[PDB]
Amino acid sequence: AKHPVPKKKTSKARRDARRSHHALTPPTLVPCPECKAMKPPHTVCPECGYYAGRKVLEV
Amino acid sequence: PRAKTGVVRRRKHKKILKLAKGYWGLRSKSFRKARETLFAAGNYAYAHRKRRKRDFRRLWIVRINAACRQHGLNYSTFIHGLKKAGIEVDRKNLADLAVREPQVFAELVERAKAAQ
Amino acid sequence: AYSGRKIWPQKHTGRARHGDIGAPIFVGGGVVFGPKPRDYSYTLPKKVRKKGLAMAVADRAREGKLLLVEAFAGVNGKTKEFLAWAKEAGLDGSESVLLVTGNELVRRAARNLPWVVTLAPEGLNVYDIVRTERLVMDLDAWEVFQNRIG
Amino acid sequence: MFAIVKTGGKQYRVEPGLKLRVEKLDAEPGATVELPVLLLGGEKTVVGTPVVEGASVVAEVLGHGRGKKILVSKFKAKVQYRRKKGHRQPYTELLIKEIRG
Amino acid sequence: MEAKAIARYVRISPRKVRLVVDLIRGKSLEEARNILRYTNKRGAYFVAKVLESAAANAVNNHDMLEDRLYVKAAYVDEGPALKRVLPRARGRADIIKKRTSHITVILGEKHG
Amino acid sequence: MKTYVPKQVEPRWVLIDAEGKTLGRLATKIATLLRGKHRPDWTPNVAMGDFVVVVNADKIRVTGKKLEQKIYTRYSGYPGGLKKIPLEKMLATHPERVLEHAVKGMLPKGPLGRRLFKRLKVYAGPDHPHQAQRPEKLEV
RNA sequence: CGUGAGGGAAAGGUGAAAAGAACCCCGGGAGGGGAGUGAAAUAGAGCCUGAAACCGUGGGCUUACAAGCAGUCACGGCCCCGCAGGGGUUGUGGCGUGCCUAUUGAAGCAUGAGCCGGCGACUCACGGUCGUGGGCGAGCUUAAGCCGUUGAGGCGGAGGC
RNA sequence: GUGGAGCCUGGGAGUGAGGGCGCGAGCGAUAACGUCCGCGUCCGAGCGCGGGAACAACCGAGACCGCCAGCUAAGGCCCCC
RNA sequence: GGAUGACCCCAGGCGGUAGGGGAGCGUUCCCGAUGCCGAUGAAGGCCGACCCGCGAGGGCGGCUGGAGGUAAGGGAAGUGC
């Protein structure tokens, strides 16, 4: 190893075009059948405590 | 007394930067970069001005040449013909003729085979 | 006021080369060919001075702007007192005046006027003449003037 | 009906109703000049050789102007040569009035 | 009408929050609140506080209706960096830029 | 007076039989037709030449010893990947290339010059699938 | 900062007046929205002016068969200002080896430069030598001083040429 | 022979690492993008313009500016062109 | 030609590094200034496709800015990155 180093400043264009895959993807959500609140599927709904379709969790 | 740079430099810099609007990235952002493109832009505009005069003529001559081989003879012959005829309509206008007024050109072609 | 220590080694730092920070190349530094107290005085040939006074008054007289006076009516120091007199003499302050007299009292009266520049006669000089539109002198000043140019 | 006329070293096809820009002619605005003709077109097709003896084209001089400023600048590398010149081309604006023969 | 709320000098780095803000731009206040809730990013907490504040402002100052609020526009700006020393190997000091964001959220009302 | 410049037009489809024609002494012409330098309203930046259907490409005639002496050539990008194929063998397998490679190297380089190449249709014919376009027969 | 001798910074500005923003609303706070003060609040204290590099948002044009010192020429399309014209952009075609320095020779794979802003280098004194604008001319000139002035000049011939 | 000829007197310089090409020699090996002289040239300073694929010095030609006008030089006139 | 920088005509020169020369531009400051411009808006900033100048630049207009600015003609430099 002989300390490799950027030859040229990365241009703004070339920079941002690195970040064309950086964009976030929103949390996927479904309505919970009981309380109707939005939550991640396959979780327990923390709003009402229900999962399929019973009380699991005292909230 | 002291004459600090003050206002002068910024102004000479904007002058150039305004002259550089349009250019890619730093060439339109960095004064220095601006100046270097403008120098090049400079000579190109001069060099290509002179060149534009000979870009159109080559085009005219192409365009004419085609119209000439429609009536069964070549640009080089035809031009010889004109000179012998004594017709000195520049080839800017020769061109135009050949594409706007087929007939007249066709007239010109005949005077040209004629004088030959 | 800074030291003279070599801020960092002549070599191998990867920084540029410098001595002390008083180097004019530093923002801390001294100025290169900056003003030093000098003396703008020089000796103009007496004759030239002599001719200018001469020529300065000449020009002005050549314009009927020169006016000599015998004395100064009732001016006894007071500024309004001078006004009076100047009015009676064609001096309304539409024109600006170099008023030359050895008379202390007359100068005191004319002094605080904006359109008057006052002067004892040994003080006459081309500039104060050229500045002013109208020259106004004593006979007694007019003499010393001619004596200056003899 | 058009003609091919010569002025300022260049040629142009003109027609009645044309405003045309030419090299500045020595001629007052409101005055009215006659351009030599090397060819007449449409219906009557007459090939000036090089000019057509009788013909002319009458144009009115609308006036004179100086064209848009051309920045002519030369730069030479490695030599500190840089020249900046401003150039406006003078012109004469013509209203073609009629064609003769 | 528009209601806007800004959070200024939030001690997070702009390029990091902007990722979260970027999700909710143009979405219904309802959608937005939801998205931010289960968005796994420190920025969410902050963007939330700004959304929520702007939500009140709308309803509370500018006479707008919660069931009509969307995020008309939003944006994160850079505020003054907190310059901090990071000591490194062989005597060298590094300078870390703990960065700072001005988070803006602007609510509009959905006509239909 | 500014020079003409045409608005867009209908491109003329043209038919040519190779057969017995000297390769490239033919190609030369196809090129011109492609650019449209035969049309008096020709423009350099525009692509208004004819669409050129050549038929019977397999029967192109060639001078000299080039049947077995001209070598067509392709490089992959691998070591030793230089492929050398003699004319003969080119006719033997992809005959419609021979005239294809010749016309192309006679077209300008650049975006447009590749556009014009697309307007070249070559079939070791006769019969070309372009009855739809009704190509006017051309001699030489 | 250095054991010490010693080295040695950065850092000025709301407004005429604090009238320094009660009270309410989101918020743990910070911050912000209203209200209020103010001639002005993108003068709100992180405060006059608020350039540029730099980062965002929104809008127009554009871009996924294309080969590049990034421009220029031409034509064309779309947007804009207007009503033979302009402005923005750029599809295609032509043309085209950065700037500086150093060199016989540099696009050069030779030096310097990340970018922007600010600081940065032919001076001054006394002599000298041409030129030059003037003054006087077989002459020309004073120096230090003295008097006067308080931005007034005069005298001083020692002396020098 | 009136030319950015010349001569005279003075102010100011820079330059005193050249280089290639043709020709004449020495050196070298009837080698070197070699070296050292002479006459000439061009680059240097014309890396401005045409030709020579590209390319300081080979051919052509000494660019004040503009033109969508014309004649040409070398070089070319099958297509790229 | 006129009568001395007033313009017109005609002809010719006008590649250029070191370098010589000549004419200008802009910055600070002085005289001009007890003046003139200035809140009906200074300096400074951001625009402009407009005007003048070969050019450096200078106007004019719009926005910002809110207290300075400084002419014709001259003078002096910490004078242009």
Swiss-Prot record, chain A:
Gene3D superfamilies: Single helix bin. Coiled coil: none annotated. Residues 1-29 are annotated as: Disordered. GO terms for cellular component: large ribosomal subunit. Transmembrane segments: none annotated. Pfam families: Ribosomal_L32p. GO terms for molecular function: structural constituent of ribosome. Keywords: Ribonucleoprotein, Ribosomal protein. Residues 1-22 have a biased composition (Basic residues). InterPro entries: Ribosomal_bL32, Ribosomal_bL32_bact, Ribosomal_zn-bd. HAMAP family: Ribosomal_bL32. NCBIfam families: rpmF_bact. This is Large ribosomal subunit protein bL32. It comes from Thermus thermophilus (strain ATCC 27634 / DSM 579 / HB8). The gene is rpmF.
Curated annotation (Swiss-Prot), chain B:
This is Large ribosomal subunit protein bL20. PROSITE patterns: RIBOSOMAL_L20. The keyword rRNA-binding applies. It holds the Pfam family Ribosomal_L20. Gene3D superfamilies: 6.10.160.10, Ribosomal protein L20. GO terms for biological process: ribosomal large subunit assembly; translation. It comes from the Bacteria. The lineage of its organism: Bacteria, Thermotogati, Deinococcota, Deinococci, Thermales. GO terms for cellular component: ribonucleoprotein complex; ribosome. InterPro entries: Ribosomal_bL20, RIBOSOMAL_L20_CS, Ribosomal_protein_bL20_C. One of its GO terms (molecular function) is structural constituent of ribosome. Keywords: Ribonucleoprotein, Ribosomal protein, RNA-binding, rRNA-binding. HAMAP family: Ribosomal_bL20. Belongs to the bacterial ribosomal protein bL20 family. Binds directly to 23S ribosomal RNA and is necessary for the in vitro assembly process of the 50S ribosomal subunit. It is not involved in the protein synthesizing functions of that subunit.
Swiss-Prot record, chain C:
GO terms for cellular component: ribonucleoprotein complex; ribosome. One of its GO terms (biological process) is translation. The N-terminus is blocked. The keyword Ribosomal protein applies. One of its GO terms (molecular function) is rRNA binding. Keywords: Ribonucleoprotein, Ribosomal protein, RNA-binding, rRNA-binding. The keyword Glycosyltransferase does not apply. One of the primary rRNA binding proteins, this protein initially binds near the 5'-end of the 23S rRNA. It is important during the early stages of 50S assembly. It makes multiple contacts with different domains of the 23S rRNA in the assembled 50S subunit and ribosome. Forms part of the polypeptide exit tunnel. Belongs to the universal ribosomal protein uL4 family. Part of the 50S ribosomal subunit. This is Large ribosomal subunit protein uL4. The lineage of its organism: Bacteria, Thermotogati, Deinococcota, Deinococci, Thermales.
UniProtKB/Swiss-Prot annotation, chain E:
It comes from Thermus thermophilus (strain ATCC 27634 / DSM 579 / HB8). Part of the 50S ribosomal subunit. InterPro entries: Ribosomal_uL22, Ribosomal_uL22_bac/chlpt-type, Ribosomal_uL22_bac/org-type, Ribosomal_uL22_CS, Ribosomal_uL22_sf. One of its GO terms (cellular component) is cytosolic large ribosomal subunit. Pfam families: Ribosomal_L22. This is Large ribosomal subunit protein uL22. GO terms for biological process: translation. Belongs to the universal ribosomal protein uL22 family.
